[PDB]
Amino acid sequence: QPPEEVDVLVVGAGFSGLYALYRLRELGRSVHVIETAGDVGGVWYWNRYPGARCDIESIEYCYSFSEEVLQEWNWTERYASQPEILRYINFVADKFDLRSGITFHTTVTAAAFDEATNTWTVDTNHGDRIRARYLIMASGQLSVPQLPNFPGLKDFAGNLYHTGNWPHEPVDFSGQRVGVIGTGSSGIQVSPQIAKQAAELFVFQRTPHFAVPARNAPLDPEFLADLKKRYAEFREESRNTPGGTHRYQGPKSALEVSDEELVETLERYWQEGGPDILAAYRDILRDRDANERVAEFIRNKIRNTVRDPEVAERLVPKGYPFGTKRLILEIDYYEMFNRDNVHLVDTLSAPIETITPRGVRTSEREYELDSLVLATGFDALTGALFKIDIRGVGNVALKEKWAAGPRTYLGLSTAGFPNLFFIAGPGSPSALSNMLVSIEQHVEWVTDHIAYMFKNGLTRSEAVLEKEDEWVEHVNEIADETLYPMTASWYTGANVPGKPRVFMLYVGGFHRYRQICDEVAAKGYEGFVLT
Ligand SMILES: Cc1cc2nc3c(=O)[nH]c(=O)nc-3n(C[C@H](O)[C@H](O)[C@H](O)COP(=O)(O)OP(=O)(O)OC[C@H]3O[C@@H](n4cnc5c(N)ncnc54)[C@H](O)[C@@H]3O)c2cc1C
Numbered sequence: 001q002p003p004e005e006v007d008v009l010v011v012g013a014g015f016s017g018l019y020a021l022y023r024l025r026e027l028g029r030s031v032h033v034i035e036t037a038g039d040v041g042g043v044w045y046w047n048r049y050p051g052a053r054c055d056i057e058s059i060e061y062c063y064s065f066s067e068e069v070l071q072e073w074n075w076t077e078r079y080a081s082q083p084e085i086l087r088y089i090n091f092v093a094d095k096f097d098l099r100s101g102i103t104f105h106t107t108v109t110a111a112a113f114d115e116a117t118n119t120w121t122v123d124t125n126h127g128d129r130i131r132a133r134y135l136i137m138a139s140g141q142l143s144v145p146q147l148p149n150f151p152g153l154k155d156f157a158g159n160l161y162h163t164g165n166w167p168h169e170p171v172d173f174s175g176q177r178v179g180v181i182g183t184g185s186s187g188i189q190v191s192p193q194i195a196k197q198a199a200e201l202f203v204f205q206r207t208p209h210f211a212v213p214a215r216n217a218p219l220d221p222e223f224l225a226d227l228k229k230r231y232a233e234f235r236e237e238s239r240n241t242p243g244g245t246h247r248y249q250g251p252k253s254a255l256e257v258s259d260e261e262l263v264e265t266l267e268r269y270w271q272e273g274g275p276d277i278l279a280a281y282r283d284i285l286r287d288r289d290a291n292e293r294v295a296e297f298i299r300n301k302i303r304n305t306v307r308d309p310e311v312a313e314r315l316v317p318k319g320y321p322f323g324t325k326r327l328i329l330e331i332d333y334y335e336m337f338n339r340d341n342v343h344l345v346d347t348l349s350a351p352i353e354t355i356t357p358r359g360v361r362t363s364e365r366e367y368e369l370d371s372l373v374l375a376t377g378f379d380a381l382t383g384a385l386f387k388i389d390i391r392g393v394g395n396v397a398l399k400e401k402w403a404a405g406p407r408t409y410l411g412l413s414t415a416g417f418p419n420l421f422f423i424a425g426p427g428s429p430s431a432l433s434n435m436l437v438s439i440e441q442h443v444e445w446v447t448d449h450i451a452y453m454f455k456n457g458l459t460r461s462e463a464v465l466e467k468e469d470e471w472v473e474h475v476n477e478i479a480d481e482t483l484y485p486m487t488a489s490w491y492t493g494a495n496v497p498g499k500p501r502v503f504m505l506y507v508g509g510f511h512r513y514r515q516i517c518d519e520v521a522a523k524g525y526e527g528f529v530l531t
């Protein structure tokens with residue numbers, strides 16, 4: 001049961017909300033959180049599909065705000081499984097008694113600024129009404145599942161699942177004819193797991209995404225002990241990087257090197273595994289010819305992975321630059337296609353027409369299935385905010401202001417909507433980074449800002465409209481220096497039909513972006529109106 005007035009409300013109980021709750025307490029503030037879900041964890045609470053695993057390594061993908069948590073906690077594998085990560089979150093939440101500051105089972109529905117009192121009044125599906133000086137939107141980047149644009153979906157007789165709203169109690173596909181739609185990270189992760197239990201597996205792929213080997217391994221518990229001795233320092237280094245990790249920044253250009261050098265250099269990445277390949281060369285995301293050279297190498301690796309060249313060629317990604325859809329880490333995925341019971345249905349030759357109660361109809365045949373798994377992604381970046389009637393000055397709706405794409409200052413706030421902050425979302429580095437580094441800066445930067453308003457006894461913080469536009473024009477200016485906006489991905493909005501095709505994410509580098517937020521805060525929050 002939620003308090004009637006509060007200094008700051010936080011929506012979302014994943015990494016972001018939890019940390020905001022922790023830190024606002026530290027700074028002597030009344031703070032409370034509302035979360036749709038039954039318990040903490042966010043993505044790692046929702047995404048229980050089998051195979052679910054982080055793609056940034058354990059030693060990197062973690063909170064660094066607590067010397068205690070760094071020293072105590074023991075990660076076991078190169079990449080944490082979803083259960084491992086959920087325990088981690090449960091551990092941190094227990095350590096600081098965080099639930100006491102959280103309402104669960106509660107979806108927020110509407111929020112509305114009030115010029116009279118400079119406060120947000122905020123409503124829920126339980127009928128709660130809450131009044132606050134600030135509202136922190138920590139409701140995520142990949143949180144509202146999206147479903148494919150297909151008729152007959154409610155007719156399917158068998159069992160229907162989305163990977164981001166997966167059952168809490170494990171599913172049995174034993175001896176079933178199972179189908180998966182979507183071959184993004186989710187579809188690539190969950191598929192080899194089902195391949196192992198199902199009688200026959202049908203993988204319905206549209207556009208092939210580029211995937212490289214994870215090469216998971218046990219963590220050497222002595223390497224973890226040396227590291228722990230300099231943990232704070234290790235992390236501080238990851239903060240001083242474009243991507244938030246120790247990924248080496250290749251100084252050279254993909255074009256300047258010989259064919260022989262390109263192969264040997266990319267081969268040492270392919271053997272090691274992980275996503276560091278993205279930065280093998282300075283200009284992979286800057287030059288069509290550079291990219292193409294890297295893209296081809298990866299393409300051949302794929303062809304050598306599958307025995308049936310016909311089926312191999314169907315997996316090769318075509319028509320978009322390498323890296324401009326999110327890069328996926330695979331484990332035994334392409335190898336899966338060698339098994340008698342695994343079938344790759346290519347929806348580009350043969351588009352899906354409809355879901356029948358027996359299964360899936362493409363243009364060429366019909367497929368019969370006991371279960372259909374939807375690994376079709378999310379209403380990315382804007383989706384969770386959009387489900388919420390957010391109204392600010394002049395009764396202006398958030399949804400409409402942003403219909404031509406997100407409009408923000410530093411991604412952190414928007415003109416016409418004072419006292420409102422978005423954690424790790426459009427206009428900022430957000431997902432183009434180890435999201436934990438993205439999430440800490442933002443929680444800190446916002447929370448420092450709230451602390452600053454109270455000490456100086458102010459009550460109203462708004463983005464100057466000119467700066468907001470200056471910023472937005474800046475984000476698209478740099479986006480267009482790269483290869484990013486030239487491909488239909490969730491970054492653009494291209495998976496939600498009708499959504500405006502614009503690249504939603506800052507591309508300058510976490511490092512660069514964070515020194516801008518620092519100068520800003522340093523000059524007393526330049527580009528804001530404070531009263
Ligand atoms: C399957 C998956 C795996 C991931 N893998 C990686 C990875 O490899 N590396 C990486 O850096 N990042 C990864 N990400 C990105 C991920 O978003 C971040 O890593 C991070 O977990 C985000 O945490 P968060 O607190 O910002 O939001 P989330 O974890 O997304 O939490 C948002 C919460 O807000 C709640 N919520 C939303 N709207 C409302 C509202 N109306 N009312 C009440 N509650 C609401 C949701 O239920 C959810 O619990 C992954 C994402 C997914 C989907």
Ligand SMILES: NC(=O)c1ccc[n+]([C@@H]2O[C@H](COP(=O)([O-])OP(=O)(O)OC[C@H]3O[C@@H](n4cnc5c(N)ncnc54)[C@H](OP(=O)(O)O)[C@@H]3O)[C@@H](O)[C@H]2O)c1
Binds near residue numbers: 181182207375
């Ligand atoms: N290992 C990890 O670290 C991990 C795991 C899961 C998620 N994530 C994060 O969250 C993002 C989501 O990954 P995701 O796989 O869940 O979602 P996604 O990347 O958006 O994948 C969408 C997939 O579903 C397909 N699809 C969507 N609509 C379709 C339709 N109407 N008909 C047929 N196919 C359709 C897409 O094909 P098209 O390409 O042709 O659109 C693609 O194959 C990831 O990129 C990453 O940022 C990370």
